[PDB]
UniProtKB/Swiss-Prot annotation, chain A:
Lineage: Eukaryota, Fungi, Dikarya, Ascomycota, Saccharomycotina
Listed name of the protein: Pre-mRNA-splicing factor PRP9
Assigned protein family: Belongs to the SF3A3 family.
Organism expressing this protein natively: Saccharomyces cerevisiae (strain ATCC 204508 / S288c) (Baker's yeast)
Subcellular location: Nucleus
Other known facts: Present with 3920 molecules/cell in log phase SD medium.
Entry function: mRNA splicing factors, PRP9, PRP11, and PRP21, are necessary for binding of the U2 snRNP to the pre-mRNA in an early step of spliceosome assembly.
UniProt subunit comment: Belongs to the CWC complex (or CEF1-associated complex), a spliceosome sub-complex reminiscent of a late-stage spliceosome composed of the U2, U5 and U6 snRNAs and at least BUD13, BUD31, BRR2, CDC40, CEF1, CLF1, CUS1, CWC2, CWC15, CWC21, CWC22, CWC23, CWC24, CWC25, CWC27, ECM2, HSH155, IST3, ISY1, LEA1, MSL1, NTC20, PRP8, PRP9, PRP11, PRP19, PRP21, PRP22, PRP45, PRP46, SLU7, SMB1, SMD1, SMD2, SMD3, SMX2, SMX3, SNT309, SNU114, SPP2, SYF1, SYF2, RSE1 and YJU2.
UniProtKB/Swiss-Prot annotation, chain B:
Protein's name in the database: Pre-mRNA-splicing factor PRP9
Full-protein positions shown: 1 to 159 of 530
Function: mRNA splicing factors, PRP9, PRP11, and PRP21, are necessary for binding of the U2 snRNP to the pre-mRNA in an early step of spliceosome assembly.
Family, as annotated: Belongs to the SF3A3 family.
Gene behind the chain: PRP9
Subcellular location: Nucleus
From Swiss-Prot, chain C:
Stretches forming SURP motif repeats: 6-46
Region forming the signal peptide: none
Additional information: Present with 2490 molecules/cell in log phase SD medium.
Subcellular localization: Nucleus
Organism: Saccharomyces cerevisiae (strain ATCC 204508 / S288c)
Purpose: mRNA splicing factors, PRP9, PRP11, and PRP21, are necessary for binding of the U2 snRNP to the pre-mRNA in an early step of spliceosome assembly.
Domain of life assignment: Eukaryota
Gene name linked to the record: PRP21
UniProt protein name: Pre-mRNA-splicing factor PRP21
Subunit structure: Belongs to the CWC complex (or CEF1-associated complex), a spliceosome sub-complex reminiscent of a late-stage spliceosome composed of the U2, U5 and U6 snRNAs and at least BUD13, BUD31, BRR2, CDC40, CEF1, CLF1, CUS1, CWC2, CWC15, CWC21, CWC22, CWC23, CWC24, CWC25, CWC27, ECM2, HSH155, IST3, ISY1, LEA1, MSL1, NTC20, PRP8, PRP9, PRP11, PRP19, PRP21, PRP22, PRP45, PRP46, SLU7, SMB1, SMD1, SMD2, SMD3, SMX2, SMX3, SNT309, SNU114, SPP2, SYF1, SYF2, RSE1 and YJU2.
UniProtKB/Swiss-Prot annotation, chain D:
Anything else known: Present with 3460 molecules/cell in log phase SD medium.
Subcellular location: Nucleus
Name listed for the protein in its UniProt record: Pre-mRNA-splicing factor PRP11
Protein source organism: Saccharomyces cerevisiae (strain ATCC 204508 / S288c)
Entire protein: shown range: 155 to 253 of 266
Subunit structure: Belongs to the CWC complex (or CEF1-associated complex), a spliceosome sub-complex reminiscent of a late-stage spliceosome composed of the U2, U5 and U6 snRNAs and at least BUD13, BUD31, BRR2, CDC40, CEF1, CLF1, CUS1, CWC2, CWC15, CWC21, CWC22, CWC23, CWC24, CWC25, CWC27, ECM2, HSH155, IST3, ISY1, LEA1, MSL1, NTC20, PRP8, PRP9, PRP11, PRP19, PRP21, PRP22, PRP45, PRP46, SLU7, SMB1, SMD1, SMD2, SMD3, SMX2, SMX3, SNT309, SNU114, SPP2, SYF1, SYF2, RSE1 and YJU2. Interacts with CUS2.
Family membership: Belongs to the SF3A2 family.
Source superkingdom: Eukaryota
Summary of the function given for this chain in its UniProt record: mRNA splicing factors, PRP9, PRP11, and PRP21, are necessary for addition of the U2 snRNP to the pre-mRNA in an early step of spliceosome assembly.
Transmembrane intervals: none
Length: 53, 145, 103, 99
């Protein structure tokens, strides 16, 4: 919950890095919902968004 | 168009779909179990079945044959589209929900008397439209029509 | 299609009043509605349709707000109810046996 | 063949589930054996039902309609391959069809 934030592979303000992280994130998410069709995708999305805010 | 008939057909189709994905969950409980387990770690409240059931791949008394991953996932995506259909129908339904007229219509029902044709395709084409193995001649493809 | 339509129509009206059909039968006098008597086989299916329509009258003014989770749970419970009675499909070879004996 | 049976005329006195569920039965008999034993040399498609009297139909042709795996080999022998293979018993109307 803290490592990716306080012990970053690269500087979190680096361009290449942020772009990469974007692409990867997208991949992981699509993979997640892809591998578990039966769970309500919208529910999960909203849950995460509200946790974020 | 009498809305009663439309809403009826809707509730009926919904019933058909529930019955289909229920038959599926029946033949291979893993379909639900798998799903539910994951759900467990996303929405903590979710109640999950007895571990024994999960392992023995049984829902009540009968332990069902274990299926391979590709099929489990397949049927899960199929059930996915089914649930999509269901959600749609439920929606339209929510948005949709004398004697002289009785004889009035019964009179027009006399129209085209010479219609020689057997009609066994309303519940059969639907029941069939959503059942196991609906593609091949008999038994080749688990996917529904 | 004709039979279906008349069954479903007389079922539509029969679902609201039950008095319009009992009047129609005495007014017209047609062998068309012969399914009204429990004698005519189709009558049974009739009893179905009406019930169904009677059901649509149940939650008129009420929406169904079932979610994905719930629908799944429901289907899983429906499959468990069908697995509850699995010791009743083992009686049919008997008749065959009788036939063999008599033949 | 289309064999018709009683119209609830006499079957109103016997309804004690005694083979009442048993449908009519057909068998191919050789004329080599008869109560009189005079002439013979042909087959008969005998049809029988408990109360009513037996019935026969001569089959000079050595083979007709003797098909080859009509259905997909399902095994409820009933009485024999002949009966399941090619008979229908409209029990609601009491009409026995055989072909």
């Amino acid at each position: 919950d803290e490592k990716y934030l306080l012990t970053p592979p690269m500087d979190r303000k680096n361009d290449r890095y942020m772009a990469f992280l974007l692409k990867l994130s997208k991949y992981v998410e699509t993979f997640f919902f892809k591998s578990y069709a039966l769970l309500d995708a919208a529910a999960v999305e909203n849950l995460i968004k509200s946790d974020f805010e | 168009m009498n809305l009663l008939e439309t809403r009826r057909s809707l509730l009926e189709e919904m019933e058909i779909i529930e019955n289909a994905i229920a038959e599926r969950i029946q033949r291979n409980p893993e379909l639900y179990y798998h799903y539910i387990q994951e759900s467990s770690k996303v929405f903590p409240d979710t109640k999950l079945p007895r571990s024994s059931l999960i392992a023995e791949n049984k829902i009540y008394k009968f332990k069902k044959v274990k299926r391979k991953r590709k099929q489990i996932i397949l049927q899960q995506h199929e059930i996915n589209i089914f649930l999509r259909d269901y959600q749609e129908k439920q929606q339209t339904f929510n948005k949709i929900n004398f004697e002289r007229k009785l004889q009035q219509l019964e009179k027009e029902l006399k129209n085209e008397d010479e219609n020689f044709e057997l009609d066994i395709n309303s519940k059969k084409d639907k029941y069939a439209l959503f059942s196991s193995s609906s593609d091949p001649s008999r038994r080749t493809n688990i996917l529904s029509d | 299609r004709r039979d279906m339509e008349v069954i479903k129509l007389t079922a539509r009206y029969y679902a609201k009043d039950k008095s319009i059909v009992e009047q129609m039968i005495s007014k017209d006098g047609e062998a068309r509605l012969n399914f009204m008597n429990s004698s005519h086989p189709l009558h049974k299916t009739f009893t179905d349709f009406v019930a169904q329509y009677k059901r649509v009258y149940s939650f008129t003014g009420q929406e169904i707000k079932k979610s994905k989770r719930t629908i799944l749970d429901n289907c899983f419970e429906r499959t468990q109810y069908w697995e509850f009675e699995k010791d009743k499909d083992r009686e049919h070879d008997k008749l065959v046996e009788l036939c063999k004996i008599q033949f | 063949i289309q064999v018709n049976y009683s119209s609830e005329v006499k079957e109103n006195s016997v309804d004690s589930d005694d083979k009442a569920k048993v449908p009519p039965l057909i068998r191919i008999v050789s004329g080599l054996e008869l109560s009189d034993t005079k002439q013979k040399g042909k087959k008969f498609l005998v049809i029988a039902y408990e109360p009513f009297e037996n019935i026969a139909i001569e089959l000079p042709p050595n083979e007709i309609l003797f098909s080859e795996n009509n259905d997909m080999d399902n095994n409820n022998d009933g009485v024999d391959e002949l009966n399941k293979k090619c008979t229908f018993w409209d029990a609601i109307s009491k009409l026995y069809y055989v072909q």
